[PDB]
Design a protein around this nucleic acid. Structure first.
Ligand SMILES: Nc1nc2c(ncn2[C@@H]2O[C@H](COP(=O)(O)O)[C@@H](O)[C@H]2O)c(=O)[nH]1
Ligand SMILES: [Mg+2]
Ligand SMILES: [Mg+2]
Ligand SMILES: [Mg+2]
Ligand SMILES: [Mg+2]
Ligand SMILES: [Mg+2]
Ligand SMILES: [Mg+2]
Ligand SMILES: [Mg+2]
Ligand SMILES: [Mg+2]
Ligand SMILES: [Mg+2]
Ligand SMILES: [Mg+2]
Ligand SMILES: [Mg+2]
Ligand SMILES: [Mg+2]
Lengths: 95, 354, 51, 21, 118, 92, 143, 110
RNA sequence: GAUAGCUGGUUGUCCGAGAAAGAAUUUUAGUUCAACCUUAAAAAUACCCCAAAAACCCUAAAUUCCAAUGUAUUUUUAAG
RNA sequence: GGGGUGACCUCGGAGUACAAAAAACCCUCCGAGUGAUUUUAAUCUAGACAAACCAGUCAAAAUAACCAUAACAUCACUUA
């Protein structure tokens, strides 16, 4: 992760994270389950459902992704007909 | 580390040596009977009944009722053996039993059952339905004398009221008729009590029809303390129980504090306690007849609530407790995307400052 | 012993509850102190000269 | 459990054996 | 493996001669224990360290008063090989609120209420 | 409901027969909406339910289809209590 | 207001039969490993000895609700050969009548795979079905 | 040398919830490879021989009798070969429901 | 100013608290997590824990969960 | 138990690890890199085990068809 670029002198970001992740404004990161397209005929139905289902990440990986992504991808997004717009925020988090 | 057994071990009586000489059972049915018989013994370890409410095991129930009809055991057994021999002497009965073509006089069976063993079955049925636990809380009686209650739905339509039947207020709107064998030298009292339906006090019950000083079997000749009131269960909480209690008394009981007026359309006045009533009239009254039945809500209850009682029909509902959800964490690990839907207050996008 | 296990059942619990509540209050009273005008206006006294 | 007084209550192999001069 | 040592209850059965040997009351047990830590906490297990900390015996050679209930008696049995235990004796009864400052604790195990009268 | 003049007499009678379980004793039909948090959507749902009731009361081709999984028990207990109701004895 | 208008919304129904009739009671799901399964509200039990036949209806707690035995004098003096299929059928009809009277309509019956093929037990089940008492207790609402 | 594959991580096959713990619906009470604890009231049996509570309450363990399923030929033969005084006992795990079924609340006084 | 998982050096005072290893790795000379630990903030239950309980052929020291009781520590949050 | 040579590199069972869990050795023995058959065994979602992470395990209720009373595919130590 280039912390100081050579052209503009800013901090770049890796594109693998933006390709295989999605940042909610609440700080959580959404990803796909590893292996949801490999050898489906050898796996059980419950395993196929667990593979197809989405999952969240923990604090360490969340901070890693926050360090690997710049300030642009951490903005607030209001997309037209966005399914995750309902999940952009957090409710009833008594911590 | 080993410990000492706190009592006899289950399989320590049989011997281990020479198992071939020891007789065995070869029937799964016999083994099942043996296991079910042994499971009912008061073991010393933690069992299923102790944890799932064996009702404190043995219960010293007070018996408040008439003594059993004293019969001659020898003569009864001799007559029964003679009847059995006379029955088995027939050849036509054996032919019918071989051809599997034989019927039974169910009416005579019902009559003889009510005469000899109906009381105990009705007692255990009332115990199962929870009659005595709510009428006396410490005592169960035996319905020695029978009691046939019947409602009239028309000209030739008669609905009986057995121990635990389901009779709707549509049939129960009019006053029922009671029948029971009794001589013309005693006094009886009939009391119809609704155990479920009191809105304010859960530990109290309603009275629908109380008539005392019944000369013999003539129930109409007796003076009625409270006029008959049709059942009125709530629409939400259904299946209430209504019990007909019959008490035999020796003296002419007179009471003014328990006297109800002619309209008697006040639920505050129709607030009864069978325990207190029996405490008051314990010297003379003895319970001998019992007839309880189930009653749920129907279209006829609205009329009783509006015209008679002058009340708005209350409606309940069997609402279930909300499902449990753990404390919401900051970073849920390996949880589905719907994890935020389990703590969502409402399915509406909330725009705070925008 | 003086007492038995069945006699000591919850004989001193209000004291434990009060001590735990006092600990909770002492931990909850943790907060930055007050900043008064004196702490800022006394620094000017370093140049207090004789006229 | 072994340290409990009810130890060996499920013991049954000593009741059946399933394994002349 | 070296683990905790369950002490059988037979060892804690007093003999008819131990009462007269240690000067104890055979009928009425004592009410309060004076405990004083003798040995150290080093080279001792972590559970013994926790017990000796929770019993309020950090400062060595300083007496502390505790109850006589089986609850604390369990811990006292666990760490019995590290403390001296005496029964608290009250020759002048429980001190009132007017003598809380003039009390004293003698070495033999008694609590005098009026100490250093003028 | 009895003063609703914007509906026909058979429509009013069919509504009073069907939805009598939610009618107050003073003859006031009541509709209630609590799904959404917006009073506008609540009123929209109430008016839609009223329209559905008007339609089901006005369309004469309603065969009145009823469920079975929730009515089998009622039918069985009805037949069973009728088995005892079959006693024909003069009374009153 | 009206003195009879009070409601006290927290209404308690002390009747143990209420939930069992409303089919919202707590079924005893579970064992699966031992037989028979104890997931029901009422349980039919047919005990066949070499002399007498007993048809009992026991609750999940173990208490007998309604019972019909060939030892009873009513059936004993009316019927011969208390062991035969005619006896089983008569006991079944009497138990069906007593169940209709007591108000119990749904019960379970789990016979062995060999007793289910018997002649007396089949006719007993047929008589119980014809008498009005139907087996296969309803499924628990929100089980 | 001659022994290979002797290394394998532990499966954590043990009892999860002890007697007295307040569990909810769905919690795995105990896992096992062989039948060591049998389920009882309100305790289901997964296809991997796991025991899970079905109702919310308190967990208990009781020594009870064992009546096998008549379809299990092995258990039927064992029962038929048992002597006249033998009754099989097992350790059954139960869940005593503490929360009531439901409540009757007033909706509207019509 | 090539690169070094490798060696060597790394400059004032005092005080507080302070850790010896489970998992991956062309990996065992190192790295990245976990468990401990440090810095600030939230809360409330924390360790000792009698009964009672945890398998079937025989099997010890003791284990795991829990009252009360003695102490105040424990669990999350943000940086590490 | 220095390298080289020999052997191994992944997964499961039993003992080592006697009783909740886990626990290594170039410690001792079994094995697996699939076959046979038919009941071809789904969606969605409570709540839990295990675990650094990736992964693996379950599973109440609700859905359409089969009895209107099952669907966990079975067997081969079934565990791989
Ligand atoms: N891994 C580890 N090393 C330690 C710990 N404490 C001290 N050391 C190391 O031990 C050495 C000092 O030895 P000591 O003075 O503790 O006897 C130093 O190399 C130091 O880094 C510890 O807690 N963990
Ligand atoms: Mg290993
Ligand atoms: Mg191993
Ligand atoms: Mg350099
Ligand atoms: Mg290296
Ligand atoms: Mg220091
Ligand atoms: Mg770290
Ligand atoms: Mg213990
Ligand atoms: Mg505790
Ligand atoms: Mg060497
Ligand atoms: Mg080589
Ligand atoms: Mg865990
Ligand atoms: Mg289901």
């Amino acid at each position: 992760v280039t912390y100081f670029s050579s052209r503009k002198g800013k901090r770049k970001t890796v594109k693998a994270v933006i390709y295989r992740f999605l940042r909610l404004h609440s700080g959580l990161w959404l990803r796909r389950k590893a292996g949801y397209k490999k050898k489906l005929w050898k796996k059980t139905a419950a395993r196929k459902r667990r593979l197809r289902e989405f999952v969240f990440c923990n604090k360490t990986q969340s901070k890693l992704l926050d360090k690997m992504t710049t300030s642009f991808w951490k903005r607030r997004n209001w997309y037209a007909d966005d399914p995750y717009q309902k999940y952009q925020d957090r409710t009833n988090l008594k911590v | 580390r080993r410990a000492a057994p706190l009592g006899p071990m289950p399989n320590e009586d049989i011997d281990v040596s020479d198992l071939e000489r020891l007789k065995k059972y070869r029937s799964f049915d016999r083994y099942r009977r043996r296991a079910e018989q042994e499971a009912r013994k008061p073991h010393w370890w933690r069992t299923y009944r102790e944890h799932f409410g064996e009702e404190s095991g043995p219960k010293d129930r007070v018996d408040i009722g008439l003594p059993p009809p004293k019969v001659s055991r020898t003569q009864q057994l001799l007559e029964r053996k003679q009847a059995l021999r006379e029955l088995r002497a027939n050849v036509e009965e054996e032919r019918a039993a071989r051809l599997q073509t034989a019927r039974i006089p169910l009416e005579a069976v019902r009559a003889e059952w009510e005469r000899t063993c109906g009381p105990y079955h009705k007692q255990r049925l009332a115990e199962y339905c929870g009659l005595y636990r709510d009428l006396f809380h410490g005592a169960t009686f035996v319905p020695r004398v029978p009691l046939h209650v019947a409602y009239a739905v028309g000209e030739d339509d008669l609905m009986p009221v057995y121990h635990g039947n389901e009779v709707t207020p549509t049939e129960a709107a009019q006053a029922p008729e009671v029948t029971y064998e009794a001589d013309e030298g005693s006094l009886w009292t009939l009391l119809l009590t609704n155990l479920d339906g009191h809105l304010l006090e859960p530990d109290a019950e309603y009275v629908h029809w109380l008539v005392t000083n019944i000369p013999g079997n003539r129930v109409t000749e007796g003076q009625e303390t409270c006029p008959y009131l049709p059942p009125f269960p709530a629409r939400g909480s259904g299946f209430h129980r209504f019990a007909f209690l019959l008490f035999k008394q020796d003296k002419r009981i007179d009471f003014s504090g328990d006297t109800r007026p002619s309209p008697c359309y006040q639920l505050a006045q129709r607030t009864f306690h069978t325990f207190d009533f029996y405490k008051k009239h314990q010297d003379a009254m003895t319970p001998a007849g019992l007839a309880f039945f189930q009653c749920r809500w129907d279209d006829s209850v609205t009329r009783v609530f509006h015209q008679l009682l002058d009340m708005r029909e209350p409606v309940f509902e069997f609402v279930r407790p909300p499902p449990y959800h753990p404390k919401q964490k900051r970073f849920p690990h390996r949880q589905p995307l719907r994890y935020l839907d389990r703590y969502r207050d409402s399915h509406e996008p909330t725009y705070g400052i925008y | 012993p003086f007492l038995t296990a069945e006699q000591e059942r919850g004989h001193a619990a209000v004291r434990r509850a009060a001590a735990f509540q006092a600990l909770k209050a002492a931990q909850a009273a943790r907060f930055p102190a007050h900043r008064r005008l004196e702490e800022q206006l006394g620094h000017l006294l370093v140049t207090r000269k004789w006229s | 459990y072994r340290s409990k007084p009810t130890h060996g209550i499920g013991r049954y192999k000593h009741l059946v054996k399933a394994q002349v001069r | 493996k070296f683990t905790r040592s369950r002490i059988p209850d037979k060892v804690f059965q007093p003999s008819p001669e131990d009462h007269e040997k240690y000067g104890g009351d055979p009928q009425y047990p004592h009410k309060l224990h004076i405990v004083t830590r003798i040995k150290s906490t080093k080279r001792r297990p972590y559970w013994e360290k926790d017990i000796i900390k929770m019993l309020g015996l950090e400062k060595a050679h300083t007496p502390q008063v505790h109850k006589n209930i089986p609850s604390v008696n369990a811990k006292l049995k666990v760490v019995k090989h590290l403390i001296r235990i005496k029964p608290l004796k009250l020759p002048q009864g429980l001190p009132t609120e007017e003598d809380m400052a003039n009390t004293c604790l003698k070495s033999n195990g008694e609590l005098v209420v009026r100490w250093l009268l003028n | 409901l009895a003063s609703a003049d914007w509906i026909a007499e058979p429509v009013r009678l069919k509504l009073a027969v069907k939805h009598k379980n939610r009618i107050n004793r003073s003859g006031e039909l009541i509709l209630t909406s609590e799904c959404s948090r917006y009073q506008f959507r609540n009123l929209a749902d109430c008016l839609q339910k009223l329209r559905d009731m008007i339609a089901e009361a006005s369309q004469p081709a309603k065969e009145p289809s009823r469920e079975d999984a929730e009515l089998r028990r009622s039918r069985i207990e009805n037949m069973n209590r009728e088995r005892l109701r079959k006693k024909r004895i003069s009374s009153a | 207001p009206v003195e009879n208008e009070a409601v006290a919304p927290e209404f308690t129904n002390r009747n143990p039969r209420n939930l069992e009739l409303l089919a919202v009671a707590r079924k005893e799901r579970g064992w699966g490993t031992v037989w028979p399964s104890r997931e029901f509200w009422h349980r039919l039990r047919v005990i066949r000895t070499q002399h007498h036949i007993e048809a009992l209806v026991e609750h999940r707690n173990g208490q007998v609700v309604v019972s019909a035995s060939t030892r009873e004098w009513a059936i004993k003096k009316h019927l011969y050969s208390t062991r035969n299929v005619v006896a089983c059928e008569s006991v079944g009809r009497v138990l069906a009548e007593r169940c209709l009277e007591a108000g119990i309509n749904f019960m379970v019956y789990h016979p062995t795979p060999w007793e289910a093929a018997s002649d007396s037990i089949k006719r007993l089940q047929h008589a119980m079905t014809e008498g009005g008492v139907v087996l296969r207790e309803p499924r628990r609402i929100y089980e | 040398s001659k022994n290979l594959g002797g290394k394998s991580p532990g499966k954590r096959f043990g009892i999860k919830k002890m007697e007295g713990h307040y569990v909810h619906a769905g919690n795995i009470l105990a896992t096992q490879r062989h039948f060591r604890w049998h389920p009882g009231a309100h305790v289901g049996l997964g296809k991997n021989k796991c025991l899970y509570a079905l109702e919310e309450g308190v967990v208990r363990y009781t020594k009870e009798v064992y009546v096998p399923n008549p379809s299990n030929s092995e258990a039927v033969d064992l029962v038929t070969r048992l002597p006249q005084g033998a009754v099989l006992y097992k350790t059954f795990v139960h869940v005593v429901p503490a929360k009531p079924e439901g409540t009757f609340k007033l909706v509207a006084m019509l």
